[PDB]
């Protein structure tokens, strides 16, 4: 069947996928020791997509844990569901790229990338044919945005036609750590705009904003935020593992969201999200999830969607619902907020109904929207990057270990052409 090979780049991406495999094992009934518990056919008829039989009966994930420092890797193994990963799937780093793009990509990620293409090709060739790879990595660092993007390149000359999905976190708008954020962000963008089939944008200030006035969590931890990302991250790949009335795989999303190959960046939201005082006070049916996914107050990227215009969108429903009030209510949100959708594409948005909800919930949805409103995120990285670059600041921490000047000019020129290809549709 279809298989999705997982890649864990950067220490942020290691903890994001650590909670992701906790979620997938929870809904597939997988013990942390690898045994199966849950005695139902529907959890197991499509388990080869994310798990592999290992002549012990246990299910090892098809995930590569990849980092340049071993501190965050041993945190994965020592934690719960860290017993699940194969020991050979960890690729240890010793020195570590110090939030530095050049060390991640050119000079220090080079001697480790040959060791990880060994295990990527080993898992990929082990099946007859896979669907694609999902890449979880961070853009505010050096291990994630420098070394993970070179992995994105190498698996694309070797596998050209497979779906390159990536869940990527971006620099947050208001306040941030890791002062070389626009340096690692712009240099990761101009490599990833021609080598990634679909990019799903995540902002940590957006994830923080979710927990405050729609979850009422006074103390959200990073395990809280990783489960936010993982809830929609399995919310894209529902129909591969579960049957439904209207199935949709990752390439169904790829072909039916992007009209042009160079623009593929997707705002991601999840629903229903209710607090403790309000779970039992809210109805759970189709008409209020569809208002939830169309809000500026649920979206997991800090780009206000009503500033821009929705080019093409999609919704992956899960659970027991009637397909009719789904069907005309994608219409009903289209025609009341008609100014927020584009005119030269009729009926901008796709549905797909899956029959299996996440556990505890009876029906949910995951929203993937290709909105022009991400232009504000690109232009915010733009004027932050040109403010640093015009004074040559921090530039010897890149140009002195294997790289030169003019690829910075090409980085901001590719990023500016990415900008200019958006307001011509707005």
């Amino acid at each position: 069947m279809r298989e999705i090979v997982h890649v864990q780049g950067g220490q942020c991406g290691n903890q994001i996928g650590a909670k992701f495999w906790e979620v997938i094992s929870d809904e597939h009934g997988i013990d942390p020791t690898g045994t199966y518990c849950g005695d139902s056919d529907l959890q197991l008829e499509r388990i080869n997509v994310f798990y592999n039989e290992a002549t012990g009966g246990r299910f090892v994930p098809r995930a590569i844990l990849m980092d340049l420092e071993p501190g965050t890797m041993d945190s994965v193994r020592a934690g719960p569901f860290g017993q699940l990963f194969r020991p050979d799937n960890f690729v240890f780093g010793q020195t570590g790229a110090g939030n530095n793009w050049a060390k991640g990509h050119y000079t220090e990620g080079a001697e480790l990338i040959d060791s990880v293409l060994d295990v990527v090709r080993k898992e990929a060739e082990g099946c007859d044919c896979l669907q694609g790879f999902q890449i979880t990595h961070s853009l505010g660092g050096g291990t994630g945005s420098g070394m993970g993007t070179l992995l994105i390149s190498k698996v694309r000359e070797e596998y050209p036609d497979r779906i390159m999905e990536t869940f990527s976190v971006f620099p947050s708008p208001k306040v941030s750590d890791t002062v070389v954020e626009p340096y690692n962000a712009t240099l990761s963008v101009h490599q990833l705009v021609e080598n990634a089939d679909e990019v799903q944008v995540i902002d940590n200030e957006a994830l923080y904003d979710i927990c405050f006035r729609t979850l009422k969590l006074t103390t959200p931890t990073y395990g809280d935020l990783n489960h936010l990302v993982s809830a929609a991250m399995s919310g894209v790949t529902c129909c591969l593992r579960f049957p439904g009335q209207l199935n949709s795989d990752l390439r169904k999303l790829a072909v039916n969201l992007i009209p042009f190959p160079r623009l593929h960046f997707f705002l991601i939201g999840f629903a229903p999200l209710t607090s403790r005082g309000s779970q039992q006070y809210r109805a759970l049916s189709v008409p209020e999830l569809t208002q939830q996914m169309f809000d500026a107050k649920n979206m997991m990227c800090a780009s206000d969607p009503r500033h821009g215009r929705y080019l093409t969108a999609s919704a992956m429903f899960r659970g027991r619902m009637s397909t009719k009030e789904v069907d005309e209510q994608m219409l009903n949100v289209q025609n009341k907020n008609s100014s927020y959708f584009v005119e030269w594409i009729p009926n901008n948005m796709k549905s797909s109904v899956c029959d299996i909800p996440p556990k505890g919930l009876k029906m949910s949805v995951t929203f993937v929207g290709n909105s022009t409103a991400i232009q504000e995120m690109f232009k915010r990285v733009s004027d932050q990057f040109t403010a640093m670059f015009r004074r040559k600041a921090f530039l010897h921490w890149y140009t002195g270990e294997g790289m030169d000047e003019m690829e910075f000019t090409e980085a901001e020129s590719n990023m500016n052409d990415l900008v200019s290809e958006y307001q011509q549709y707005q």
Partner: peptide, 11 residues
Amino acid sequence: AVAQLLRSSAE
């Protein structure tokens, strides 16, 4: 986790 207790909640 609180996210575990919110997202997969049924009671």
